[PDB]
Tab-separated table of C-alpha atoms in Angstrom:
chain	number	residue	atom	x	y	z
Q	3	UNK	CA	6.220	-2.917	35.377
Q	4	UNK	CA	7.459	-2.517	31.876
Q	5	UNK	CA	9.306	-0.233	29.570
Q	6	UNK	CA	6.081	0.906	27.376
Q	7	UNK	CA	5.442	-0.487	23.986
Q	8	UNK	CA	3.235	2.484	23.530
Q	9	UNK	CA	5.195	5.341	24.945
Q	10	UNK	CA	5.390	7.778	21.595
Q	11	UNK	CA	1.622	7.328	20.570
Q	12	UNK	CA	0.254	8.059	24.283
Q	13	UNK	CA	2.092	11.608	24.050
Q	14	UNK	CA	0.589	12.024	20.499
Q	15	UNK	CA	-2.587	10.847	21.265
Q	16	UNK	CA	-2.882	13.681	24.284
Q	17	UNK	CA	-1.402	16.069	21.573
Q	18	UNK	CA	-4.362	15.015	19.397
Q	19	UNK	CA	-7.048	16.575	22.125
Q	22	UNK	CA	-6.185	21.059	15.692
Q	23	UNK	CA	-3.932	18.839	12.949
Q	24	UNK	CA	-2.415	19.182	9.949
Q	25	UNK	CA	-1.681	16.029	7.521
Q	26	UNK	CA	1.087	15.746	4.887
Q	27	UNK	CA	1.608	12.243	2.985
Q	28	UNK	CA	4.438	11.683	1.324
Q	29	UNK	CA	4.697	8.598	-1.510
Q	30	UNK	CA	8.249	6.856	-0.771
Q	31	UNK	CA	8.629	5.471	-4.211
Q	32	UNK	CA	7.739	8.868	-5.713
Q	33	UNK	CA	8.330	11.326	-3.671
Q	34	UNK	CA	5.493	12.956	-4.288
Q	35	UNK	CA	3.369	14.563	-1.468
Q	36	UNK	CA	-0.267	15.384	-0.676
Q	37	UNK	CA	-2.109	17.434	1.821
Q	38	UNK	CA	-4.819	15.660	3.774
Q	39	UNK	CA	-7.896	16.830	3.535
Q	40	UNK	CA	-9.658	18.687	5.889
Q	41	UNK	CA	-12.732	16.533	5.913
Q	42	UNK	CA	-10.424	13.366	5.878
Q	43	UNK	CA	-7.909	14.568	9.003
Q	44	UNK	CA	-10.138	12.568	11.427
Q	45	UNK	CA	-8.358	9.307	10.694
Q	46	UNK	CA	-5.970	9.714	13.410
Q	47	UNK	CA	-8.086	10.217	15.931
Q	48	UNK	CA	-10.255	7.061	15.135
Q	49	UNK	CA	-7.521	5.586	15.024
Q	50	UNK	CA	-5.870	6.372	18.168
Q	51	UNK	CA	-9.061	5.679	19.718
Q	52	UNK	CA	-9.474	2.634	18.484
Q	53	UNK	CA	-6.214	1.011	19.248
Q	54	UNK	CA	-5.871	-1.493	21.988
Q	55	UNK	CA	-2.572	-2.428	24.120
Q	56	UNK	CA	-2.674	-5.525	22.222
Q	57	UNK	CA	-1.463	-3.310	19.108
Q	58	UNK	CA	1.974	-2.079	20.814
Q	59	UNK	CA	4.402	-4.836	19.016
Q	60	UNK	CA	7.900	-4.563	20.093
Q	61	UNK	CA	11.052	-3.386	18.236
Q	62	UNK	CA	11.643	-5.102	14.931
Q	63	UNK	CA	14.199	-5.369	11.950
Q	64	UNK	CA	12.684	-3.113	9.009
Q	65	UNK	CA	12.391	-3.333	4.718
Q	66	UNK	CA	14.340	-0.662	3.783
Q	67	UNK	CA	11.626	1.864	3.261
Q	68	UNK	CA	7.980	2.250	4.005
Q	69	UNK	CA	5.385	2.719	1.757
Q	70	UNK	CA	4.319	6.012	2.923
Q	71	UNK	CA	5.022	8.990	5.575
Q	72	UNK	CA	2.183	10.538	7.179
Q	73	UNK	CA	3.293	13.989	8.752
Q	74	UNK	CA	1.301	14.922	11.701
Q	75	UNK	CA	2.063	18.691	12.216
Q	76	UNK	CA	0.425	19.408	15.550
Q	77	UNK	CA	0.800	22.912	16.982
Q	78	UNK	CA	4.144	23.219	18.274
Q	79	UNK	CA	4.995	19.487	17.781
Q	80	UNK	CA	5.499	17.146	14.520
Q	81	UNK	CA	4.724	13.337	14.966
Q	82	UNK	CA	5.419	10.620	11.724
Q	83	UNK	CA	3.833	7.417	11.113
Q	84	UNK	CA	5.904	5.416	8.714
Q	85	UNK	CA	3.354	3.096	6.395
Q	86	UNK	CA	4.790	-0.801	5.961
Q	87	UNK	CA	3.516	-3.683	4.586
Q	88	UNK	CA	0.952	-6.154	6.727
Q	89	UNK	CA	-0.884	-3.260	8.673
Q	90	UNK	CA	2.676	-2.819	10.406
Q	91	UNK	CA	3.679	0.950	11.260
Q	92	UNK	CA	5.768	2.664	13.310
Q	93	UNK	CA	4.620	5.777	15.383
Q	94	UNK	CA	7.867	8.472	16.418
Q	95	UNK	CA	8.041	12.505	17.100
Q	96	UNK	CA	9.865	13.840	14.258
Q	97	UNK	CA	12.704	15.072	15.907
Q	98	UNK	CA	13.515	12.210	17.967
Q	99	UNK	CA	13.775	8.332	16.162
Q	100	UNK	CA	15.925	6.442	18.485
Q	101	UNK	CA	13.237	4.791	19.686
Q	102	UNK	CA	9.746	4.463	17.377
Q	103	UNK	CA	7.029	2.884	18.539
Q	104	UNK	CA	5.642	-0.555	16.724
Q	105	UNK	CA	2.277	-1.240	15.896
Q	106	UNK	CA	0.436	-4.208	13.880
Q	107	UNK	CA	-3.088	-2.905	12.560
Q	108	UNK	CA	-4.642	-6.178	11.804
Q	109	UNK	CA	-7.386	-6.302	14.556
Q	110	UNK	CA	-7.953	-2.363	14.273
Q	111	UNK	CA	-11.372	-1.357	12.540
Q	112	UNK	CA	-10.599	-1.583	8.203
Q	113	UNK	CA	-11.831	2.129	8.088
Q	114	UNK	CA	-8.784	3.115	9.654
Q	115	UNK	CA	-6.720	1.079	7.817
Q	116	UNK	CA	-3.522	3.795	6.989
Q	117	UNK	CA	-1.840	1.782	4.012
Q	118	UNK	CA	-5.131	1.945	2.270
Q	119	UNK	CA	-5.870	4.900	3.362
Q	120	UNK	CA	-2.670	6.681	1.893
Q	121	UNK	CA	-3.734	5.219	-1.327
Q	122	UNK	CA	-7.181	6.701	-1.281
Q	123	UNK	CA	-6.100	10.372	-0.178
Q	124	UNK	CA	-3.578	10.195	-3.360
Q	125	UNK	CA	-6.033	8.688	-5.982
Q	126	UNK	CA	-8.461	11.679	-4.869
């Protein structure tokens, strides 16, 4: 009925059924490699997103806090880290349209702001 709210993370979560994770500190510019025994935060928290997540477009701060590079395969996918459990979801190649998401209800494990903060103070 509607033009999808979730369209980007759909395709990533069926992408997501071997990954590679890079995090990159935007104040810094200083980047990490995700562990392998930490890698399993995207999936939990792809499955544990509800429609009620998918936000619509909004205006933006001028930078997130972090990148998370998802280097599937053949594909890339990045998840830009805001403020307020708000991040957006987009295949690297292709930004004209990113998908929104507010994190607030999601379970605090999968949390990605402090999660990105975690993986770097390892």
């Amino acid at each position: 009925a509607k033009p999808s709210l979730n369209y980007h993370t759909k395709n990533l979560s069926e992408l997501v059924s071997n990954i590679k994770i890079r995090l990159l500190d935007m104040n810094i510019y200083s980047e990490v490699i995700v562990d392998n025994e930490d890698v399993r935060i995207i999936d939990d928290l792809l499955k544990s997103l509800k429609d009620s997540n998918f936000i619509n477009e909004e205006a933006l701060p001028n930078k997130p806090l972090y990148k998370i590079f998802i280097d599937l395969n053949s594909e890339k996918y990045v998840i830009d880290i805001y403020g307020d459990d708000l991040i957006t979801l987009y295949p690297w190649d292709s930004d004209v349209r990113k998908d929104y998401l507010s994190l607030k209800d999601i379970p605090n494990s999968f949390k990605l702001e402090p999660f990105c903060q975690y993986v770097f103070n390892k």
